Amino acid sequence: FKPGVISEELQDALGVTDKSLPPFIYRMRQLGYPPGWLK
Amino acid sequence: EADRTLFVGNLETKVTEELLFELFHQAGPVIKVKIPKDKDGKPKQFAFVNFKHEVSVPYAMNLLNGIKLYGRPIKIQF
Ligand SMILES: [Br-]
């Protein structure tokens, strides 16, 4: 599980311009570590 | 007895099962994503995301609801 690492197909779907900007990591830091990955 | 299924709607037509798999994989391990068919075999505008664990469902709701895919914000009603 590598958070915010996504494929090029998903980047185009998300509309991400810059591949070095990790998506979803900012909010995960707030929500906490996804519980379904702990187990 | 545990419900690990999410209903996600308002999907743009280009959204695929593999695309949703990778996206919801961020919220937790995903088992499968199914986009049901119409009476003429047409894909519907919603999908079922089945997680390995129930706890992944509320988390994905907060993390991923409203995210725009191809300009269309997904709606996670489940
Ligand atoms: Br986000």
Residue numbers in the entry:
A (entry chain D): 286 to 324
B (entry chain A): 7 to 84
Please give me the paper's original passages concerning this structure.
The complex between ZCCHC8Pro and RBM7RRM yielded crystals diffracting to about 2.85 Å resolution, with seven complexes in the asymmetric unit. The coordinates of the Sm-derivatized RBM7RRM–ZCCHC8Pro complex allowed solving the structure of the native complex (Rfree of 30.0% and R-factor of 26.2%).
In the nucleoplasm, however, hMTR4 binds the RBM7 and ZCCHC8 proteins, forming the metazoan-specific nuclear exosome targeting (NEXT) complex. NEXT promotes the exosomal degradation of non-coding promoter-upstream transcripts, enhancer RNAs28 and 3′-extended products of histone- and small nuclear RNA transcription. We conclude that ZCCHC8 is a scaffolding subunit that bridges the interaction between RBM7 and hMTR4. In this work, we have shown that RBM7RRM binds a proline-rich segment of ZCCHC8 at the back helical surface and is able to concomitantly bind RNA.
